[PDB]
Amino acid sequence: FAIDPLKHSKLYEEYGLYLRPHAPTIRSIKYASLIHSMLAEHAARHNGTLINPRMYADMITLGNTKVTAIVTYKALTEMSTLIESFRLPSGLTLIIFDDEKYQSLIPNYINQLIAYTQPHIIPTWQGIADFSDTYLRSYFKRPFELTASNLAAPQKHNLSPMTRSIFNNTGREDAVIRKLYGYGEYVFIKYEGCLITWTGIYGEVTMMVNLSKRDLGLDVGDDYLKEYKKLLFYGVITDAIPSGISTRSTIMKISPHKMMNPSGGALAVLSKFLEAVVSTNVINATLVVYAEKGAGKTSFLSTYAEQLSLASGQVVGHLSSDAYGRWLAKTKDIEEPSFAYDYVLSLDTDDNESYYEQKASELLMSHGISEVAQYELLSVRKKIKMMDEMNEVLIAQLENADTHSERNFYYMVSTGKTTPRILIVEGHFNAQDATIARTDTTVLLRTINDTTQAMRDRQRGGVVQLFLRDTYYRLLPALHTTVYPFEMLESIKRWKWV
Amino acid sequence: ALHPMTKVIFNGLDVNTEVQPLSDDFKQISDPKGYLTYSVKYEDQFTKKDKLRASEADDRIVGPTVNLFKYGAAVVNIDLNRDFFDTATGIDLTKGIPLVQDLLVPIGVTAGAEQSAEYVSGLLMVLFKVMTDNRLVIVGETTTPMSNTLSTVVNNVLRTTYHNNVGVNPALLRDFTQVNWLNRDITNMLQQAGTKYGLGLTETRLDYVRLVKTIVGHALNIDHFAASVLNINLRALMEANVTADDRIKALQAHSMISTQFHGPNQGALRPELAFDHDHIIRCLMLAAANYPRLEGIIVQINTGYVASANVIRPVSEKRYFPENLEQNQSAARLVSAVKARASEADISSIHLAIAREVSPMFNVHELKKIAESFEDPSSIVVVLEFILFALFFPTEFNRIKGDIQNVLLLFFSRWYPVEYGIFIQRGATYTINAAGEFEFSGRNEKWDQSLYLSEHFPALFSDVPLAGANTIIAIMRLFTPQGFLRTDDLAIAANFPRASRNPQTYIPYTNQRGTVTNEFASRFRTIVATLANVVNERAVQDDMQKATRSCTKQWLRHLETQFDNIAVAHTDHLSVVYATMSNFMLNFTNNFSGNHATFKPDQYVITSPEGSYKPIIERQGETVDGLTIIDTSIVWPILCQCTYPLVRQSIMEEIVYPDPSTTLSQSLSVAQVLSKLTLPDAFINMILSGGDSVVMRTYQTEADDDLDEGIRMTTYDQYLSHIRERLHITNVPDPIYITGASTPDQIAASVQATHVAVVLYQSGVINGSASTYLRENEVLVVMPDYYDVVSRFANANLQMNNNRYHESVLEIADIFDQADFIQTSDAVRQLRALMPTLSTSQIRHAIERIAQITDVDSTDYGKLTLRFLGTLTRSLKMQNAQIRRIRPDGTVLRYDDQIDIEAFRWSRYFLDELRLRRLSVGLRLITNPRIARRFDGVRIMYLTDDDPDPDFVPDVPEGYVAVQYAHRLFSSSLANKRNRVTYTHPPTGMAYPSPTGRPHVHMTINERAGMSKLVADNIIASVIKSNWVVDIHDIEYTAEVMTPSEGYTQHVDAESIMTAPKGKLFHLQFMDGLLRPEPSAFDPPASGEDMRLIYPLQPISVARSMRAIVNHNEVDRPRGAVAPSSYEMDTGTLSRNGDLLYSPVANGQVGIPKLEVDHISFSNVVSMMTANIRTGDDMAVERVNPDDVRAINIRNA
Secondary structure: OOOOOOOOOOHHHOOOOOOOOOOOOOOHHHHHHHHHHHHHHHHOOOOOOEEEHHHHHHHHHOOOOOOOHHHHHHHHHHHHHHHOOOOOOOOOOOOOOOOOOHHHOOOOHHHHEEEEOOOOOOOOOOOOOOOOOOHHHHHHOOOOEEOOOOOOOOOOOOOOOOOEEEEOOOOEEEEHHOOOOOOOOOEEEEOOOOEEEEOOOOOOOOEEEEOOOOOOOOOOOOOOOHHHHHHHHHHHOOOOOOOOOOOEEEEEEEEEEOOOOOOOHHHHHHHHHHOOOOOOOOOOEEEEEEEOOOOOOOOOOHHHHHHHHHHHOOOEEOOOOOOHHHHHHOOOOOOOOOHHHHHHHOOOOOOOOOOHHHHHHHHHHHOOOHHHHHHHHOOOOHHHHHHHHEEEHHHHOOOOOOOOOOHHHHHHHHHHOOOOOOOEEEOOOOOOOOOOOOOOOOEEEOOOOHHHHHHHHHHOOOHHHHHHHHHOOOOOOOOOOEOHHHHHHHHHHOOOOO | OOOOOOOOOOOOOOOEEEEOOOOOOOOOOOOOOOOEEEEEEEEEOOOOOOOOOOOOOOOOOHHHHHHOOOOOEEEEEEEEEOOOHHHHHOOEEEOOOOEOOOOOOOOOOOOOOOOHHOOOOHHHHHHHHHHHHOOOOOOOOEEEEOHHOOOOHHHHHEEEEEEEEOOHHHHHOOOOOOOHHHHHHHHHOOOOOOOOOOOOEEEEOOOOOOOOOOOEEEEEOOOOHHHHHHHHHHHOOOOOOOOOHHHHHHHHHHHHOOOEEOOOOOOOEEEOOOOHHHHHHHHHHHHHHHHHOHHHHHHHHHHHHHHHOOEEOOOOOOOOOOOOOOOOOHHHHHHHHHHHHOOOOHHHHHHHHHOOOOOOOOOOOEEEOOOOOOOOOOOOOHHHHHHHHHOHHHHHHOHHHHHHHHHHHHHHHHHOOHHHHHHHHHEEEEEEEEOOOOOOOOOOOOOHHHHOOOOOEEEHHHHOOOOOOOOOOHHHOOOOOEEEEOOHHHHHHHOOOOOOOOOOOEEEOOOOOOOOOOOHHHHHHHHHHHHHHHHHHHHHOOOOOHHHHHHHHHHHHHHHHHHHHHHHHHHHHHHHHHHHHOOOOOOOOOOOOOOOOOOOOOOOEEEEOOOOOEOOOOOOOOOOOOOOEOOHHHHHHHHHEEOOOOOOOOOOOOOOOOOOOHHHHHHHHHOOOOOOOOOOHHHHHOOOOOOOOOEEEEOOOOOOOOOOOOEEEEEEHHHHOOOOOOOOOOOOOOEEEEEOOOHHHHHHHHHHHHHHHOOOOOOOEEEEHHHHOOOOOOEEEEEOOOOOOOOOOOOOOOOOOOOOOOOOEEHHHOOOOOOOOOOOOOOHHHOOOOOOOOOOOOHHHHHHHHHHHHHOOOOOHHHHHHOOOOOOOOOOOOOOOOEEEEEOOEEEOOOOOOOOOOOHOOOOOOOOHHHHHHHHHHHHOOOOOOOOOOOHHHHHEOEEEOOOOOOOOOOOOOOEEEOOOOOEEEEEEEOOEEEEEEEEOOOOOOOEOOOOOOEEEEEEEOOOOOOOOHHHHHHHHHHHHHHHHEEEEEEEEEEEEEOOOOOOOOOOOHHHHHOOOOOOEEEEEEEEEOOOOOOOOOOOOOOOOEEEEEEOOOOOOOOEEEEEEEOOOOOOOOOOOOOOOOOOOOOEEEEOEEEEEEOOOOOHHHHHHHHOOOOOOOEEEEEEOOOOOOOOOOOEEEEEEOOOOOOOOOOOO
16 A cells, blocks of 8 residues: 555544454555555655665566665665565555545655556545455455344344444444444444435435534435535535535435545645734735635625634624625715725625626616526527626726726725725636735635525526626636635634634 | 565465455345235234243244234235335335336326326336345354254244244144134144145255255245245355356466466355356447447556556667767658657557557547658658558557558559559459459548448458559568467456457467577568668669668668567567457457458447447547557657567566456456446336337228237338347248238248248238138238228128228237247236336336436446446437347348357347346246235225125126216206206116216216316215216225224225326225124114225235134134135245245145245245355465466467
8 A cells, every 4th residue: 555554544444444353465464564664764764765766666566676886776675685575476556545635645755656656546436435456355344334224133144343344324323233233343434424415406416514414413304404504614515516406405315424635735725814814924814715606605704704703813804795796886976985894894785786786687688588487598609698798897897996996996995994904805706816905815615506506596586696697607717726615614723823 | 474584384375365256246144034024903902912922942933923913913914025125225015015206107197197107116126126136045043942842833843943033924823822713724724735834954965075064945934936036046156066266267367378376275165156158248238339438448457457567668768770870961861750750658658559459449440640741762661660560569550451551552652653553443442242252442532440340441451462563562461460369268268258259369479489580570571671672662763862772771770670679578578468468358359360351340239129229339539538549650669769678688677477356356347337237227128128019900801800800910111110120130031922822821831930920911912711811820911001901802701891990009029929039928018008108218217217226336446437437328229139240331130140159149138147037036926916906996886884894895786777987978957947967878868967866877987087077076976866886997096904993094085086187096994894892782872874985896905814813702713714825834845946846735746836826835945055155255376477478378279
């Protein structure tokens, strides 16, 4: 393996993969972990990088290159007496298995062998690591599912504690199943999240949350609005958008799943803002969050201000993402408008109409339409010309820095002393980046919401909400870091505070 | 287990690898669950709510039987098993019948009319769960009692041991029940000769060598439908006669050639099924049809073998030119042509080009568009590129040999201008005549890879000497391969799937040990010595330099030196890799057969009589991101800038022999997934195999005929679309043409040769002798059209008329009765009359509902494999899908007995050898009258409910009149100052306005469609007031038999029984009024009576086994109480075949098999393996690598 499973056994225990008790593969897994103590030393000797990894990788992987002036070829000579020591007929082989938690924990000296190996890759289904493959199935503990059908004996299904482990899928308590059903000495895998298979408008949709089955309710076949607030905070809908879940959708089945790991490429981009909020150097740091119109983030990043301000000991305030549109409708006409922070937040959500929803509303009429089912009858290029017409009322507020333009609004709200130290703006469409000011941290929010389903939901949605989600998706590609709303709640916690 | 390092003495077996099983095929349950269990409805008054306690040693055997037939049982039904057909498989068993929600639903109905089709979809999943029941019983927690602790009525029963889960069987009620008539009726039955109940160890098969117990048969308490399934799974695991040591044969194929595997010699104690040849090769042809990305897997398995063997390593030193010709001015035109073609030696694509040579080709390969001029005499570098691509990769040379003609006809038309005109008048393409001639086309066409699947060949590769073109043909003799044709001896002995009769792959070049001159390198000497004279003539015809001709020929023999240095490593270490890659599992097609002039790959298709045919090999341009484009500039890094593990001899190398288990486990995890991936396709298309229909007519030929008798006639267009495509499949001749003068013996000669009674009409007037033969044998006559069809026959009786016929449909399962093609059993014939009118979009919904139910076991490569292909299946029609070769013209050939493999003759619904054997046992469970409790037909009558039993069918009295129901009878009429609904009695013609004075009518409703609600009120008002009897033939309903202490729970209104859609499934509750409390003699009477409006037609409680297990205090046995049937208590024996027999009734009588009759036997001998078998373990071998790679023999042997 890349990480040896006898010195580092708990990581495989986190995946549901327990080490088989102590034979030609029990002897081989001790042989591979002996190489890692040799290999690790060698890439100490010269920091870090073990030297000539090509003749290294043609020894572990291939039963090849016995070698015997010297000190150059010293670590090769010490090793050719180590791998010809145990008699193998071929190489040892690698086993990265495609997981951002597992791939991050690979040490430096193993990764330098990956260029010259052709390693064996084990494809994760959603995580767990799924148990084929004479490596993964002869080394340790091919498991046994324990759903509501296979009850209730280990003698019945012919299991043995030295070969098969047991995956609790009852819904019963954990402690009783190895008490009265005879599953003592049978070790049990521990999963601390769960996977939900919802019904959908389009089909079966499998999402996961990193909460256990006890931490939230909803079993089995409760609707989508019951404990909706916990699902938004912790869910990924592992499906190609449009997934198509709705507020009338229910649960098909629940199984405990591995707690998924957040995104080392998307943890660090969000970690810049969680450094610039801390340091007294950076005046007025800013977090910019892009999403679709129906991602449901105004209900989400209202409490992430509540999670950051209680951890930082400061005052934060989110600008609620439409506060250009609510405000410009109120004072199109007014020569000197009030740019104050308290005036902006006492204006929106919801009763003041947006300015673009006036403009979009007038426009839909001209190509006369008022029904959502009438919008399906329209099709793409005849639609897309409407989107192009919709743009030219966009650019009139983005181009120059007039006194009613977008550039002046996100400036003077951000500067003027009444505002909070670290506002969070949210933008709908990309190429608002020349307007929001000023930051090094723009993320992209993808929540558990088929957003166009939520715009036929909205419940005074109409076509005006749904035309603009479609217009903004034409302006918002995924050219920034997707941020996955449980990961911002995860990074507050990781950060080390004062 | 042992210690480092220096080869200590080990007196065991030096185990270094461990081998997985070849097929995860069986479950290994210990306590078996049956298909049918008893279900008892207790009467709450007479019963006693305690637990009955006998002797404690008797309490483990008799215990759960006397606590289920406890004193006071009203009815005892035999229903489907709840904890086998559980809610994980969608089957609901609350109302008695199996019900699946959304499997076969009708369309165009009212929103509640899909409930009646939930019974038919229930009987599919009950058939489906038995069909995929792969359980294999292991001996559980069997206890052994002392004989002096059991009473003597149990000691004559018990065979030496018993499982702790003893089950429930009424034969154990002998001398344990309180009921006296039951104890007499069971003892009188068990003392017959034809039955003998037992329990426990019957047979014990000791092993032949080890002398331990292996296979025992315990007389369980389980129905014979589940026990026959558990005995088929054991009679094919033990009588396959192949151990777990035949996994070694699958390892000798996937490892290097002439390797060895020692031990462990486990013997017959560790059996395993043979790796199924006929089912894996039959399912790879669907997986090559529906999922054309499957080449992307099989190449990637073969690519991962080559890169793990460490066979070619690219180096960073370039020796394209000899020393100080690079810089030499005259060669400046030559060094630009070589450096433009040659390309850097990426390690990823040299390993790809090797693996493409023995891979199956599904997407038709095509050449990278080489844009060259053939202008200067320095342009021979492109021709030398093609010679090296023809010697190194002659298989992949063949697949793109046509596009090389599109390049080389620019070569010959610019250097040999007169010779090209002689050659191109013969033709640029040619076909093959049927007798073996070559038919040259005579046209000048650019080749395309579209023509690769057709009957055209490239004409440069004809190898035919043209009189006058002896120069072009002599250059084309340099593109011949230098290999041999090795049979796949390691794959056939390992019983791998192959698509041929003789599995023969083309290894590109011979192993060449012990030679001084290499006979593959010296072939390239004679090519350059031929190419030196070709470039000599082109240089001196066009008068170029002396130095440019010398620096060309000094380069041609620098490729001589570099070819000698690496052919020692090709013909010793590449050739043993192409031998061992040919014996892999998924490399099943042949690739090449020696001659470029004749080869085409055998085009199998998936034909269908009700759809299009989907070819396997098909140019569709579906790239796998670089797979269909073939790079001919790969032979320049192979020849020059790569170092080999034998060209380096002088450094120590230790030639890498890779492990068998990586390319084996990837090949199983593909061949295990697609073995069951087409399995929900394989079930609905098996029930519907004969569901296709033709439109025929029937002309009555005499007086007093019915709609069905006569001459059966259909049109020629109806024949040509349905029946003609199903006669080329079944391999019969064409049906004959009857011409009017035809004798009836000629028609009998065609029916007994073409096994369907179909004759074709041609012309003439068919005489009366054959016309009586066409009547008494139901022979289908195929007419061209229906224009004066009397005049085509000799109507001598003068009763056959043009306007006298009954046009009706005729199913294909009625005229074809073939075993493995159309399922024509008595069970499946009943389902296609219970199904609604299906369509090609409701079978699609039926398949995707079964696949949602089935949660099959994948692995960590399975789902990844499963995902890869990975989403499109619903394009191909799978009606009667067979596997047939086609002509390159494009017509589907018949099954030829001597070319195709045996497993392509009858595609057995794309199923398993075992899965048909469980299916015929499953069809006996579906046609069983004990579970057919979907009751149709209901009767409204107004009799009193005084002695209730569910069997009660009220007889129509003598004075009623049978009246068919129509909408013409009831109409509004002004009767007495009020519009009343008036019935018009059809015989007497009168009118009856009020429902009191209506005559005695037995009305039979067949339709109830468009029936008014006031009319439906008036008929139920006519039952109450005027005592009609109304039969409704549309209502489907279930029925629970209520005990008289429980009482009726729900009721059915008369509004629902009359105003409902056609497909609504009701639930009537009937009361078994046998255990009602008799009132005291001094009690003053009650006021009212118990009426009863709804009655059944056919007898309720066909599932009833026992009824009213009590004793009566005045009479000996109660009125109507039944005894358990004497076949429910007979174990019998187990036959030698594996069939379950009853007990014989006399001496010298073979007992009746339990599947031949329809009675249920709840005790059976089930062969189960003991703890000394352990099927499906990880056995352990010693792999020994060969010594040298030059000592490994390949051919001939």
